[PDB]
Short mmCIF file of C-alpha atoms and ligand atoms in Angstrom, two decimals:
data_model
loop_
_atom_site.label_atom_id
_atom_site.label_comp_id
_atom_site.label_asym_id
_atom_site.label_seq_id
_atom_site.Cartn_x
_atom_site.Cartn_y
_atom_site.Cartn_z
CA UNK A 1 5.48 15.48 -10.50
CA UNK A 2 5.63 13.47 -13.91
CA UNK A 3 2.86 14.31 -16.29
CA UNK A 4 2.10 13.16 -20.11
CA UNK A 5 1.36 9.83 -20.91
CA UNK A 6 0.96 6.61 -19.01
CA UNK A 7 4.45 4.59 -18.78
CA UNK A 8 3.45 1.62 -20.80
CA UNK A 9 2.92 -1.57 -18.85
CA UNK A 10 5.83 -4.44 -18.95
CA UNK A 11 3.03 -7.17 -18.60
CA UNK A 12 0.03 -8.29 -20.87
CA UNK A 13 -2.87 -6.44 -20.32
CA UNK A 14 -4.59 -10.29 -19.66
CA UNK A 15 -2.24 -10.99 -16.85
CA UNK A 16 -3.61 -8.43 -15.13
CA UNK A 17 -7.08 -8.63 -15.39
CA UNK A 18 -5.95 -11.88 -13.56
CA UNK A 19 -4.89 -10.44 -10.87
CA UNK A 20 -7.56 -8.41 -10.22
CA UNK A 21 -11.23 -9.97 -8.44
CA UNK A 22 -14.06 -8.46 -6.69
CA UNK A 23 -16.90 -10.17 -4.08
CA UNK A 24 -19.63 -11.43 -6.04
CA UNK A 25 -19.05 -9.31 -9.60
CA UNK A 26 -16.86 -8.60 -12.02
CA UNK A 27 -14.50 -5.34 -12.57
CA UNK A 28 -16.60 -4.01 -15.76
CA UNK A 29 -19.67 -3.66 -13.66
CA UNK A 30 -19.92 -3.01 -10.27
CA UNK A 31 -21.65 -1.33 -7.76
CA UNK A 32 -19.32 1.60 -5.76
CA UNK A 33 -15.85 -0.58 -5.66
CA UNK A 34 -13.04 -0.12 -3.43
CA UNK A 35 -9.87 -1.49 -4.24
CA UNK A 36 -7.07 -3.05 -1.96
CA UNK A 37 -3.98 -3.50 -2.55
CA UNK A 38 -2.36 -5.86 0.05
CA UNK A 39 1.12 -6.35 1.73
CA UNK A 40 4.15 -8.05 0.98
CA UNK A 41 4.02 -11.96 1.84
CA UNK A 42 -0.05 -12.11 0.81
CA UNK A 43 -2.42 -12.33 -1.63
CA UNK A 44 -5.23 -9.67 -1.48
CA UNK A 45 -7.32 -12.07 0.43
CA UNK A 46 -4.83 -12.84 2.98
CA UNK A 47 -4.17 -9.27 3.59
CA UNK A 48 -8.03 -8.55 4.08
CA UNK A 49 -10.59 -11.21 4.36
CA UNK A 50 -10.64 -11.06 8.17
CA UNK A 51 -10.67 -6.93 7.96
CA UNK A 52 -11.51 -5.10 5.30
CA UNK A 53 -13.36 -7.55 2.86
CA UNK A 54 -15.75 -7.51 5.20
CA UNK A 55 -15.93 -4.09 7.04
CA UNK A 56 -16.23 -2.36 3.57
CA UNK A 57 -19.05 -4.53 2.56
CA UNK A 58 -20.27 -3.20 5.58
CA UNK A 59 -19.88 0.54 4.49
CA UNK A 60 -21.40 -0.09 1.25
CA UNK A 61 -18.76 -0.92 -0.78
CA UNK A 62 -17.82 -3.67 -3.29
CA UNK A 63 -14.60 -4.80 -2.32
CA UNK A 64 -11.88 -5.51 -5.37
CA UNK A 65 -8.18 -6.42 -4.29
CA UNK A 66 -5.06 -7.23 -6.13
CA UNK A 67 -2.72 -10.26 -5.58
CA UNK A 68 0.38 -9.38 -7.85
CA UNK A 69 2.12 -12.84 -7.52
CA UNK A 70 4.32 -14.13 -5.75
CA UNK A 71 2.76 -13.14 -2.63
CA UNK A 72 3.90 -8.97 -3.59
CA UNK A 73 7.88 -10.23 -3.14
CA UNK A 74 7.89 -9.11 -7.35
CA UNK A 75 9.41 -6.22 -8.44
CA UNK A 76 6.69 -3.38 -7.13
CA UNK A 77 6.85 -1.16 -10.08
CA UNK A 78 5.22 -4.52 -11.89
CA UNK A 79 2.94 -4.61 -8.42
CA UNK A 80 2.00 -1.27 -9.36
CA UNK A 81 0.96 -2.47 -13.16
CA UNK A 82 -1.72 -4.43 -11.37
CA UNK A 83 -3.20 -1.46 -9.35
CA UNK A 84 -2.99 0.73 -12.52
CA UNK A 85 -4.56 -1.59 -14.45
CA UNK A 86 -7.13 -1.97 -12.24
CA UNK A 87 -8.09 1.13 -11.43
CA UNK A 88 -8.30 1.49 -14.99
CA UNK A 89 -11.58 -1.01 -15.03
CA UNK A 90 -12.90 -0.10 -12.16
CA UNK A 91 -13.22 3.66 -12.94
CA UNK A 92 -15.01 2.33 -16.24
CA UNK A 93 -17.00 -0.61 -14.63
CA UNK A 94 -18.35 1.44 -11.93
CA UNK A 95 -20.14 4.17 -14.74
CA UNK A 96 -16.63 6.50 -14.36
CA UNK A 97 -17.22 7.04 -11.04
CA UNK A 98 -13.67 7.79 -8.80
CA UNK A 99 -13.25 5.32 -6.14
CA UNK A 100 -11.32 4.95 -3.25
CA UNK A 101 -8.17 2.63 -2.81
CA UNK A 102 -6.96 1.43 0.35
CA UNK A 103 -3.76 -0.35 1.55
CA UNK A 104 -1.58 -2.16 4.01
CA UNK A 105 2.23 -2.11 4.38
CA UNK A 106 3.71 -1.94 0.31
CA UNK A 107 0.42 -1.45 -0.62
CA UNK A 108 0.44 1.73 0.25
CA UNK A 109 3.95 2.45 -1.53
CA UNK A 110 2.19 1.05 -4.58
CA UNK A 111 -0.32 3.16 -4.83
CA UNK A 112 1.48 6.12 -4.22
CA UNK A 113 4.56 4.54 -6.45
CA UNK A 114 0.96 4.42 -9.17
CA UNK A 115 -0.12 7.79 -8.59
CA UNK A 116 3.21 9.49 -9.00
CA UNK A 117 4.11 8.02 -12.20
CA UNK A 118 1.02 7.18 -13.62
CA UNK A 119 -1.05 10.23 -14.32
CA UNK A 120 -4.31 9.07 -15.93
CA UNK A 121 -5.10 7.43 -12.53
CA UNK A 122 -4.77 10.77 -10.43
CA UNK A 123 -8.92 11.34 -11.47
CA UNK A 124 -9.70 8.13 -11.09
CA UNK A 125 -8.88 7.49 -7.20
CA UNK A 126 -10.93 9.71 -4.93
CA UNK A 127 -8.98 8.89 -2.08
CA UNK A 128 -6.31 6.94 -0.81
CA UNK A 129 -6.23 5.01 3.22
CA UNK A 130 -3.28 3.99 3.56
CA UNK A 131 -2.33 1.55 7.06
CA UNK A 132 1.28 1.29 8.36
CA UNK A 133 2.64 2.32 4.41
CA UNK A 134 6.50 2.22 3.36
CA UNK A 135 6.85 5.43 1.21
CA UNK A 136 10.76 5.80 2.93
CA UNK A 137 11.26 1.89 2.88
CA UNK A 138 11.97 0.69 6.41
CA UNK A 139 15.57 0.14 8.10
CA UNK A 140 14.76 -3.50 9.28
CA UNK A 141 15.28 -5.28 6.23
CA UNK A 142 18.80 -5.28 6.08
CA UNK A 143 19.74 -8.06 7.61
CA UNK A 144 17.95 -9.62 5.42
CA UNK A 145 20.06 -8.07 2.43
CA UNK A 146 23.30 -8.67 4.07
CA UNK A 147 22.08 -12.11 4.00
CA UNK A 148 20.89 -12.36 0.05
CA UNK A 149 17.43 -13.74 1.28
CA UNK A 150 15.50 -10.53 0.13
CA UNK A 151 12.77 -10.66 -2.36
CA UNK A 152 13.09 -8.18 -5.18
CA UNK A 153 10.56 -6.12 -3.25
CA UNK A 154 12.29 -6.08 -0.11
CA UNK A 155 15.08 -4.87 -2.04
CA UNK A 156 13.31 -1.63 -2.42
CA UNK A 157 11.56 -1.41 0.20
CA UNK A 158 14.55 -1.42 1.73
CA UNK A 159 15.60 2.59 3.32
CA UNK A 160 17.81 4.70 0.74
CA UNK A 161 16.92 2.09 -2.05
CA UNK A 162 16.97 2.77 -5.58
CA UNK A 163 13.72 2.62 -5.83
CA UNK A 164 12.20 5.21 -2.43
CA UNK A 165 14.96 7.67 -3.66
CA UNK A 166 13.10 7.86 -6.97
CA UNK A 167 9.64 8.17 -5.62
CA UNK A 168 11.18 11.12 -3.35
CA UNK A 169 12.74 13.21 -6.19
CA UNK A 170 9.67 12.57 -8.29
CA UNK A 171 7.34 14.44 -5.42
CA UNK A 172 6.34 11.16 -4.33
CA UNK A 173 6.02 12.21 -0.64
CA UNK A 174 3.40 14.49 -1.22
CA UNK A 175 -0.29 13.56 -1.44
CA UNK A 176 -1.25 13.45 -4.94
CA UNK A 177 -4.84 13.18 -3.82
CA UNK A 178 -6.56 12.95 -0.25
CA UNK A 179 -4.67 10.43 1.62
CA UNK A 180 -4.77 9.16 5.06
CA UNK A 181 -1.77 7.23 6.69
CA UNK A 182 -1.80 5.27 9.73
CA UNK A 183 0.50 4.06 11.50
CA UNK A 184 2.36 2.89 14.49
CA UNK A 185 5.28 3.58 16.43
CA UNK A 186 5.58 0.33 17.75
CA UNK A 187 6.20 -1.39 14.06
CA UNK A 188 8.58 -4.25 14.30
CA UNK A 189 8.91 -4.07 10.50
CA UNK A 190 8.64 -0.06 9.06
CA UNK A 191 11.06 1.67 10.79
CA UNK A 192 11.82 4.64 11.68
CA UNK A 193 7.96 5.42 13.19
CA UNK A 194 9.14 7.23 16.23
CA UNK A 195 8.88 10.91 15.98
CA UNK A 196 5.50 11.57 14.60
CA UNK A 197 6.52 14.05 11.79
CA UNK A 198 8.49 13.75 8.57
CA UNK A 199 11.04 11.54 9.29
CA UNK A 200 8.26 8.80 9.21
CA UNK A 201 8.19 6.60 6.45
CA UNK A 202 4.45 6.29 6.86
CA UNK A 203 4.51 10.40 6.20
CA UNK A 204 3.32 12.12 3.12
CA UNK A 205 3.40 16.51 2.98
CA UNK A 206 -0.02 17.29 3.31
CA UNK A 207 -1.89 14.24 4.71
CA UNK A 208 -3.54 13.20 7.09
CA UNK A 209 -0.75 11.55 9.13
CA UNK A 210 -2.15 9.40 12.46
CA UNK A 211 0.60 8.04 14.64
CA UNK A 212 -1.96 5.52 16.94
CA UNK A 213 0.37 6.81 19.91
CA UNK A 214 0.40 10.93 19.25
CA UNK A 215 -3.31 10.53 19.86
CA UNK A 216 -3.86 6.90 22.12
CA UNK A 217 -0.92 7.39 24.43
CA UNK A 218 2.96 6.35 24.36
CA UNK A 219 1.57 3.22 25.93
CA UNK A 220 -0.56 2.13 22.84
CA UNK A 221 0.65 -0.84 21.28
CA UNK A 222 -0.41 -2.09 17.98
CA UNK A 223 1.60 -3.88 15.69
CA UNK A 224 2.48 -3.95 11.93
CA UNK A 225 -0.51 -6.01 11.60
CA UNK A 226 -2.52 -4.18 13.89
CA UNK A 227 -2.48 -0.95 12.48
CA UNK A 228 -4.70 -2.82 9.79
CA UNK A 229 -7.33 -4.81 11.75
CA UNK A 230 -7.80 -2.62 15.04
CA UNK A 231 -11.25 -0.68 16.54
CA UNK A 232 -8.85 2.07 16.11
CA UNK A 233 -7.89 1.40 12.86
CA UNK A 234 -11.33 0.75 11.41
CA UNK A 235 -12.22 4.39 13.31
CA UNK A 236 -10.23 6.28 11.61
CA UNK A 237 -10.59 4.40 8.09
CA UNK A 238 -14.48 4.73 8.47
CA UNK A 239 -14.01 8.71 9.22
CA UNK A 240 -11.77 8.31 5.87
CA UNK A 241 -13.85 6.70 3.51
CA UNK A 242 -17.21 8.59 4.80
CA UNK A 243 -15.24 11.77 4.79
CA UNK A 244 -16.50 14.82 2.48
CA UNK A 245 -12.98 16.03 1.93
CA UNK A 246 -10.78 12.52 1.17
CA UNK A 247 -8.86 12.56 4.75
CA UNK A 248 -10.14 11.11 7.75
CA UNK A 249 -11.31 14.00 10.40
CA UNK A 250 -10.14 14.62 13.80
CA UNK A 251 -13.34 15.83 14.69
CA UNK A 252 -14.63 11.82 13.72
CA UNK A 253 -12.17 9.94 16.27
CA UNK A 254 -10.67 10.30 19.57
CA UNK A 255 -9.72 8.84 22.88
CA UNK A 256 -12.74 6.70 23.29
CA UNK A 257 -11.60 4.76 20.41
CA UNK A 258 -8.43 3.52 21.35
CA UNK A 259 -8.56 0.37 21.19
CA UNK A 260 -5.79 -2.22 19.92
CA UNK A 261 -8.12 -5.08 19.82
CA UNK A 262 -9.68 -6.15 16.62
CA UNK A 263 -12.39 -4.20 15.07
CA UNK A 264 -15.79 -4.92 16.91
CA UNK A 265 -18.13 -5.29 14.23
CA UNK A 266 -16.27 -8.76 12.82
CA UNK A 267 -17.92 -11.70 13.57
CA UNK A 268 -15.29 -13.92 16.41
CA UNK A 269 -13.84 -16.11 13.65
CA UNK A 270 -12.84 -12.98 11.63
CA UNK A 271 -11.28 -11.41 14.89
CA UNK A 272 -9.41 -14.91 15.24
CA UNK A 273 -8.02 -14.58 11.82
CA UNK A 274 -7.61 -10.99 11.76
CA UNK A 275 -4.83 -11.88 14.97
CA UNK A 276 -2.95 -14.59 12.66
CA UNK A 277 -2.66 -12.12 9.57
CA UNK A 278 1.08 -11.66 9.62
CA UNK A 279 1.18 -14.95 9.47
CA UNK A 280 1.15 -16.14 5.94
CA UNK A 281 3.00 -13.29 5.29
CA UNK A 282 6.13 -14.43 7.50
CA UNK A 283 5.93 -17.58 5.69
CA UNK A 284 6.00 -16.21 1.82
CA UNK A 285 8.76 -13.87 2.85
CA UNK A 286 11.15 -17.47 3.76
CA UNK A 287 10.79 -20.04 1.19
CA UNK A 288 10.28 -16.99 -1.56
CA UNK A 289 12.44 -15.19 -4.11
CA UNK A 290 15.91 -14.40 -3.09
CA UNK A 291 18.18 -12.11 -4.44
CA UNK A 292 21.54 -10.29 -3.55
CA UNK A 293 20.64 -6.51 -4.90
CA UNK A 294 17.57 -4.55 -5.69
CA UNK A 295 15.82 -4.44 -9.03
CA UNK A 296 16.37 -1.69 -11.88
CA UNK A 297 14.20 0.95 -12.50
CA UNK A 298 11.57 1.20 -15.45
CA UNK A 299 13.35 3.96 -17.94
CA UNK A 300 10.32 6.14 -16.65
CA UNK A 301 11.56 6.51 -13.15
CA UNK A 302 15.63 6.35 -14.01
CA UNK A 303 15.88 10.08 -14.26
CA UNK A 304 14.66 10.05 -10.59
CA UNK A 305 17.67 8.03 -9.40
CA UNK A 306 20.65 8.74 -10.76
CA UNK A 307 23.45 7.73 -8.95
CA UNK A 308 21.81 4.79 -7.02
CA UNK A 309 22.89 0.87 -7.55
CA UNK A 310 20.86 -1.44 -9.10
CA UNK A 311 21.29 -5.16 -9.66
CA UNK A 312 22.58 -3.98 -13.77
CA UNK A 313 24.77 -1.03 -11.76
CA UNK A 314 25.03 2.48 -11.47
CA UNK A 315 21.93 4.80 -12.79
CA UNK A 316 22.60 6.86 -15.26
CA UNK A 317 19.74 9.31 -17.09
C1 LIG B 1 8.47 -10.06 -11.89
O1 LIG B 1 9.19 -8.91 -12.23
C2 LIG B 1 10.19 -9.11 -13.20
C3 LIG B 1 11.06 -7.87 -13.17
O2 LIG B 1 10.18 -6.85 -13.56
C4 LIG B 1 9.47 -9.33 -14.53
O3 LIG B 1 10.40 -9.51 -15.58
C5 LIG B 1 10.17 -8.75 -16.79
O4 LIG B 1 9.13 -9.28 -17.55
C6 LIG B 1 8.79 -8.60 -18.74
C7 LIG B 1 7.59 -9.38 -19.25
O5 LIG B 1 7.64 -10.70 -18.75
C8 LIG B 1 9.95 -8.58 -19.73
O6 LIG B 1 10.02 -7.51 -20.65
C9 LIG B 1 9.14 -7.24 -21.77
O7 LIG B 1 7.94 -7.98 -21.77
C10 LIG B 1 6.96 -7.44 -22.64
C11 LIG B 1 5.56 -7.95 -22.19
O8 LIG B 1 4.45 -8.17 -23.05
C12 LIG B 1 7.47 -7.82 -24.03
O9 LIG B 1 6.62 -7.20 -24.97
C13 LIG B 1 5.82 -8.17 -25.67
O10 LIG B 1 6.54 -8.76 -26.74
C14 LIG B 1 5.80 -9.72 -27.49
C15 LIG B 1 6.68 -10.59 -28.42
O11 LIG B 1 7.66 -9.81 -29.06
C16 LIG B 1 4.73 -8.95 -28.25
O12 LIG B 1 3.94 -9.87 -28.98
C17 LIG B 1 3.84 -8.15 -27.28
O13 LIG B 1 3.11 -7.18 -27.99
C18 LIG B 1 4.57 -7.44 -26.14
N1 LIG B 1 3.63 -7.34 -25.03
C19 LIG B 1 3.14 -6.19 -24.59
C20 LIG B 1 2.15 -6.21 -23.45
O14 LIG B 1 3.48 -5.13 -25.09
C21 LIG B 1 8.92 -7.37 -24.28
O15 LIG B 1 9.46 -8.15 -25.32
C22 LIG B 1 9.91 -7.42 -23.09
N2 LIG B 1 10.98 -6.39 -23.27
C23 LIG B 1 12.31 -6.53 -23.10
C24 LIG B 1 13.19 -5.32 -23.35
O16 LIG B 1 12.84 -7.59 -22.76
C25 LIG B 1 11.16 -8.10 -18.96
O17 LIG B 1 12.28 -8.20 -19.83
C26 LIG B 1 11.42 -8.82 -17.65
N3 LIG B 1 12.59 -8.21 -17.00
C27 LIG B 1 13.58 -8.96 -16.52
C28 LIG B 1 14.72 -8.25 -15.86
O18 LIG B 1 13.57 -10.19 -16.58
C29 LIG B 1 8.61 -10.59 -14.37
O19 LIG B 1 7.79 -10.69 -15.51
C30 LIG B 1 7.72 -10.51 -13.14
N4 LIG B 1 7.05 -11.76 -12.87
C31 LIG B 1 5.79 -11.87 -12.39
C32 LIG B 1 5.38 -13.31 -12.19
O20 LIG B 1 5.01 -10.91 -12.11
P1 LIG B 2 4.80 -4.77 4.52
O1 LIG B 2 4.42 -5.24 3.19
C1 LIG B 2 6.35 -3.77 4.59
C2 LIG B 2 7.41 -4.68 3.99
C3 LIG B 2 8.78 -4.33 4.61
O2 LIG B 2 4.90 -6.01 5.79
C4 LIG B 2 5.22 -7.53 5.86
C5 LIG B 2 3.98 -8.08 6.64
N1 LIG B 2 4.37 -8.42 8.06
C6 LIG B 2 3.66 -9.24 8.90
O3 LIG B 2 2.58 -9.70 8.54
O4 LIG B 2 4.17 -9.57 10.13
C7 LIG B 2 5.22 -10.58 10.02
C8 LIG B 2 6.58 -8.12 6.40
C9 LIG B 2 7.88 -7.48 6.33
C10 LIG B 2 9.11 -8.01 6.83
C11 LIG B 2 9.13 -9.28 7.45
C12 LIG B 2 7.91 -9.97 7.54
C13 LIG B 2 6.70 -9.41 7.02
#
């Protein structure tokens, strides 16, 4: 695991703090945040206004986000500048007070992309919930290279891409602090799901890994999206956030809660958008960025892939 100083960031600090809001206050002071870092194809309010905007507020939480632009298709080591960045402020504006972070799709490979090769942040982030998370890439999105219609980050979040091999050699697919993955075996996007166990991209050494179906039944569906919004979903991330120990608890979930329908406690409207949230997201991905290979590596992470191709060629140290 990488240790020493911070990698410094490619952006202005000022850029940043622009991507970075919270509900009703602002990053240097406020009450208990929780940050979110959203999926590729949305902004942070896309990914969570009809979920977790509101369900946190809810818990008792002030809910910050992140909307790296455009839509997370960007390079996701410059996605990750944003979550630094702002977990950087809002360890400060909340009194220095750890908070959790929590996730959907890339987000989660941010965070964990953050935490693995940006030390100062590894006291900062009590906890880490993590829904239907990339840390392998997925196999699906080559079609979409073999067509040159790939955003840079679909580039790497593409399976054996420069950029998952270097997360992997840096000890990137271990929890770095209490983390809780869920997922689904049903994803029509991250694949390979399946065998509830390593091989899973959503898997991390040491977490708390949830496959919906290894507990619900081989007959539970929920979707990419759904493994965000669901009664399920909000289940288990309420046993994570409320949990003593970081990870949610088996003990705090079981088969009375499957269910693949949106979270209860959202008000109809928010249950109606929460069912449209891949959506937007579909949309970004098409009229977006295209390229025809994946983004280079920061120098801080090239040592992790040497021998991988990146759009300047082969990595060397
Ligand atoms: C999407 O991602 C792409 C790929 O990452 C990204 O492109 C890269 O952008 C950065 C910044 O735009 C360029 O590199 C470095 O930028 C820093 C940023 O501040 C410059 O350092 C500043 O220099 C000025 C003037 O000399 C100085 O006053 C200031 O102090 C410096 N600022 C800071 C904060 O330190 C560097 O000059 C520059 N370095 C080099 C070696 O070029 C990258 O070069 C871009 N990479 C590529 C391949 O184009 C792009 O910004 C992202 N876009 C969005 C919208 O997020
Ligand atoms: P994540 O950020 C993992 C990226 C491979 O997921 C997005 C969100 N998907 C939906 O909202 O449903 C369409 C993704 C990935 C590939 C194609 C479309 C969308």
């Amino acid at each position: 695991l990488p240790s020493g100083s911070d990698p410094a960031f490619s952006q202005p600090k000022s850029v940043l703090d622009a991507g970075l809001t919270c509900q009703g206050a602002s990053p240097s002071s406020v009450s208990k945040p929780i940050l979110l870092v959203p999926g590729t194809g949305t902004t942070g309010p896309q990914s969570f206004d009809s979920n977790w905007i509101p369900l946190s507020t809810q818990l008792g939480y002030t809910p910050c986000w992140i909307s790296p632009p455009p839509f997370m298709l960007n390079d996701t080591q410059v996605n990750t500048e944003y979550m630094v960045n702002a977990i950087t402020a809002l360890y400060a504006g909340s009194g220095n007070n750890k908070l959790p972070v929590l996730t959907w799709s890339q987000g989660g490979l941010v965070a964990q992309w953050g935490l693995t090769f940006f030390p100062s942040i590894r006291s900062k982030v009590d906890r880490l919930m993590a829904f239907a998370p990339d840390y392998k890439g997925t196999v699906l999105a080559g079609p979409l290279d073999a067509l040159a219609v790939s955003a840079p980050s679909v580039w790497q979040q593409t399976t054996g891409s420069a950029l998952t091999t270097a997360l992997r050699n840096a000890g990137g697919l271990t929890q770095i602090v209490p983390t809780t993955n869920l997922y689904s075996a049903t994803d029509e996007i991250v694949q390979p799901q399946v065998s509830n166990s390593p091989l899973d991209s959503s898997y991390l050494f040491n977490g708390k890994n949830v496959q919906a179906q290894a507990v619900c039944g081989p007959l539970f569906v929920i979707d990419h999206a759904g493994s965000l919004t669901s009664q399920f979903s909000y289940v288990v991330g309420r046993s994570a956030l409320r949990s003593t120990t970081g990870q949610a608890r088996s003990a705090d979930y079981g088969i009375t809660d499957c269910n693949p329908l949106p979270a209860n406690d959202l008000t109809p409207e928010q249950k109606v958008a929460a069912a449209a949230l891949l959506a937007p997201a579909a949309a970004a991905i098409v009229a977006g960025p295209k390229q025809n290979c994946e983004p280079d590596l920061m120098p801080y992470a090239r040592p992790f892939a040497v021998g991988k191709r990146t759009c300047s060629g082969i990595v060397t140290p």
